[PDB]
Amino acid sequence: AHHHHHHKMLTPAFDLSQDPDFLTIAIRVPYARVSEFDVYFEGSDFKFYAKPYFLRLTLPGRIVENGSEQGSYDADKGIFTIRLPKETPGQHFEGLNMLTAL
């Protein structure tokens, strides 16, 4: 037997990874109705916009603003990736596996 639970802006699924220089956020946007996306970051705050998607995260550490962030999109897979430079090089961000949309 199957039971489905259903609980409009969408919150996108996403996957996180890191190395000592960057935090990488890969955002699943298959149902995007735009081909232009906007990202804002400030300290540990992260926002991503692409109608109908909105994603806000509080990151486990801070990101530096110096224009060195790296954005790219894969139209085949429907995934936007942003690499965000760590304010403290070598800081290992903890608990990424349980980070959840604000």
Side-chain angles (χ1 to χ4, degrees), residues 1-7 9-102:
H2 167 240
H3 177 86
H4 182 71
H5 177 78
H6 174 86
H7 168 236
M9 74 193 86
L10 305 178
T11 310
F14 59 90
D15 294 290
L16 303 167
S17 60
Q18 65 186 315
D19 63 16
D21 304 302
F22 296 88
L23 171 82
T24 294
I25 312 184
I27 314 184
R28 185 196 301 174
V29 292
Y31 309 136
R33 292 179 175 181
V34 290
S35 51
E36 311 233 18
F37 317 143
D38 292 288
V39 162
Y40 299 80
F41 58 98
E42 172 165 307
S44 57
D45 191 52
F46 173 82
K47 296 172 186 173
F48 165 89
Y49 299 85
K51 184 196 172 62
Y53 297 105
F54 169 60
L55 179 63
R56 191 180 182 185
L57 300 172
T58 302
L59 305 180
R62 302 169 45 90
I63 301 304
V64 58
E65 170 181 0
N66 56 11
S68 65
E69 77 273 10
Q70 300 163 8
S72 66
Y73 177 68
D74 192 325
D76 295 327
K77 288 124 183 64
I79 298 180
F80 173 79
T81 304
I82 181 73
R83 307 189 73 221
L84 301 165
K86 296 183 169 167
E87 180 183 75
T88 298
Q91 181 180 4
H92 181 260
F93 283 15
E94 308 293 338
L96 293 179
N97 300 352
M98 45 200 114
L99 226 66
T100 318
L102 255 55

